[PDB]
Design a protein around this ligand. Structure first.
Ligand SMILES: CN[C@@H]1[C@@H](O)[C@@H](O[C@@H]2[C@@H](O)[C@H](O[C@H]3O[C@H](CN)CC[C@H]3N)[C@@H](N)C[C@H]2N)OC[C@]1(C)O
Ligand SMILES: [Mg+2]
Length: 267
């Protein structure tokens, strides 16, 4: 049998999602298994589980982010710059590599979307406008970003069959850690500003490895190493959602652990 909305709500409640919570899900739909109405069923169950006062925040990004094509240039190359679509928050699809559920979240009625084209965050709930803005170039996952507000707002991370590399909020620990040698990237995004396309060039912390030893692609990064150490050392609610082994993590706790872990290892 495929899982019904009501069964997933029950499981989410057994795991510890309460009415009013602020949740950031990371979902492997393959693990979950078959759903009554496809992925919309799990979206629907999440919304019901947090209730009319709860909030959902998701890292959705942008299917057509020109990140690789502009990485390391002081300006977009000319082929890119002439023809690349400007980021349109109402219509730009989610990046499919961060989870097929994110396109269902972002198109949910009333969903708000953040303005950062590559780091774009979507939010549903009464606090959604406050969560998603500001979201400036140069502040992808660190202070002043939606992640920072989620951490101040008692956020919980819900990992539904996702691995320890999927914990986006740990890039906040990388941004703020007082460690030597932190990598930075320079890249360019096409924004829509008063109906016109504008290319904006920025630098930010490298989200694909904050130090050279975390930057191999083959290759656990710091997010994954922190999360694995954390999960070995901490009591975390664990249980099934659909067919997937799921965890509910206190986001402020895991980020604090991450800052200490990084600062304890790098001089
Ligand atoms: C949509 N643009 C994205 C861009 O935002 C960024 O994406 C990274 C992503 O590669 C990392 O994750 C990826 O690489 C990790 C090891 N490097 C392992 C997990 C894997 N999903 C995330 N932890 C942070 C994102 N911003 O670099 C890759 C990309 C596709 O160009
Ligand atoms: Mg509230």
């Amino acid at each position: 049998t495929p899982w019904s909305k009501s069964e997933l709500v029950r499981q989410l409640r057994d795991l510890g999602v309460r009415s009013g919570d602020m949740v950031m899900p990371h979902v492997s739909l393959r693990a979950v298994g078959p759903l009554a109405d496809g992925p919309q069923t799990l979206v629907d169950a999440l919304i019901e589980a947090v209730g009319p006062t709860g909030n959902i925040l998701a890292f959705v990004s942008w299917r057509d982010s020109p990140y690789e094509q502009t990485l390391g240039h002081d300006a977009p190359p000319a082929a890119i710059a002439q023809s690349w679509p400007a980021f349109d928050p109402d219509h730009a699809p989610a990046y499919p590599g961060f989870g097929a559920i994110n396109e269902f979240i972002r198109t949910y009625p009333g969903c708000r979307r953040s303005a950062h084209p590559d780091a774009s965050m979507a939010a549903i709930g009464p606090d959604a406008a406050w969560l998603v803005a500001p979201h400036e170039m140069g502040a992808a996952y660190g202070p002043r970003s939606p992640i920072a507000r989620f951490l101040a707002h008692a956020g919980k991370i819900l990992s539904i069959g996702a691995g320890p590399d999927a914990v986006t909020a740990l890039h906040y620990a990388e941004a703020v850690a007082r460690i030597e040698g932190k990598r930075r990237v320079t890249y360019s995004m096409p924004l829509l500003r008063e109906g016109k396309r504008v290319w904006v060039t920025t630098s930010d912390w490298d989200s694909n490895g904050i130090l050279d030893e975390y930057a191999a692609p083959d290759g656990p990064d710091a997010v994954e190493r922190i999360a694995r150490d954390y999960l070995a050392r901490t009591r975390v609610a664990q249980g099934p959602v659909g067919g997937a082994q799921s965890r509910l993590i206190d986001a402020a706790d895991i980020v604090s652990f991450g800052i200490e872990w990084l600062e304890a290892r790098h001089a």
